[PDB]
């Protein structure tokens, strides 16, 4: 496929995504723990008509870290691009914001990067 | 002045900076607590020949959060620009990295923004 499918990040998390009508991303994000408690809803968007010059396909998605088993009062957004060609990959940067009081807002947002592959 | 002087962020921290030869920034960063224990060395760089088209002056600096009184095993970099004109301001985004073990690297880096004024 292109975007639709099962992907893995560098830590062993799983990104199970469908790239649907008119730019919708839906699916499930599974932490590296891999149990029922580790599965979360994701939703996002992607460019459904990318450039044809070799550039990647822009996309983003959000996980709110609540499921029926637990709640970490936080949400992560991944912003990135799908790179097709010989060895497909999704390269992202992410922002993890936790709910905080106003005085603790400096501690609210973590930043990092994840690369997803089909391996 | 332009950059050289005493500045304050939105939380009451103080940025005491000298913009010196050939692009050097040196000075002291003082947390909002304002006591001796709250003073840290800063060093950085700035564009000593900015554009003359109305654009700001790019700059950055680092504080390692160790002084003779305490050590938070962490460092913050502020990346931004000085905007002169009627009401001078330095607008920044910052990255606070704490030393972590490899398995805790996802918790390593906080991100935020600070605006400094001469008020």
């Amino acid at each position: 496929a292109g975007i639709t499918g099962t992907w893995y990040n560098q830590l062993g998390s799983t990104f199970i995504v469908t790239a649907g009508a008119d730019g919708a991303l839906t699916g499930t994000y599974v932490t590296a723990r891999g149990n029922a408690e580790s599965r979360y809803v994701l939703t996002g968007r992607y460019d459904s008509a990318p450039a044809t010059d070799g550039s990647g396909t822009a996309l983003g998605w959000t996980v709110a870290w609540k499921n029926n088993y637990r709640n970490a009062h936080s949400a992560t957004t991944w912003s990135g691009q799908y790179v097709g060609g010989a060895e497909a990959r999704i390269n992202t940067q992410w922002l993890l914001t936790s709910g905080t009081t106003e005085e603790n807002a400096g501690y609210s947002t973590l930043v990092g990067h994840d690369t997803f592959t089909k391996v | 002045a332009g950059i050289t002087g005493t500045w304050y962020n939105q939380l009451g921290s103080t940025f005491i900076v000298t913009a010196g030869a050939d692009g050097a920034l040196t000075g002291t960063y003082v947390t909002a607590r304002g006591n001796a224990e709250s003073r840290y060395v800063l060093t950085g760089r700035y564009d000593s020949a900015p554009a003359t088209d109305g654009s700001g002056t790019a700059l950055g600096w680092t504080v390692a959060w160790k002084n003779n009184y305490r050590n938070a095993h962490s460092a913050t970099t502020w990346s931004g620009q000085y905007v002169g004109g009627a009401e001078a301001r330095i607008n920044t985004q910052w990255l606070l990295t704490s030393g972590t073990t490899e398995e805790n690297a996802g918790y390593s880096t906080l991100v935020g923004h600070d605006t400094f004024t001469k008020v």
Binding site: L11, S13, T31, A32, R33, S38, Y40, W65, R70, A72, S74, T76, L96 | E103, N104, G106, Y107
Partner: peptide, 8 residues
């Protein structure tokens, strides 16, 4: 303190 994004 433990966050699911980073759990093993």
């Amino acid at each position: 303190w433990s966050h699911p994004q980073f759990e093993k």
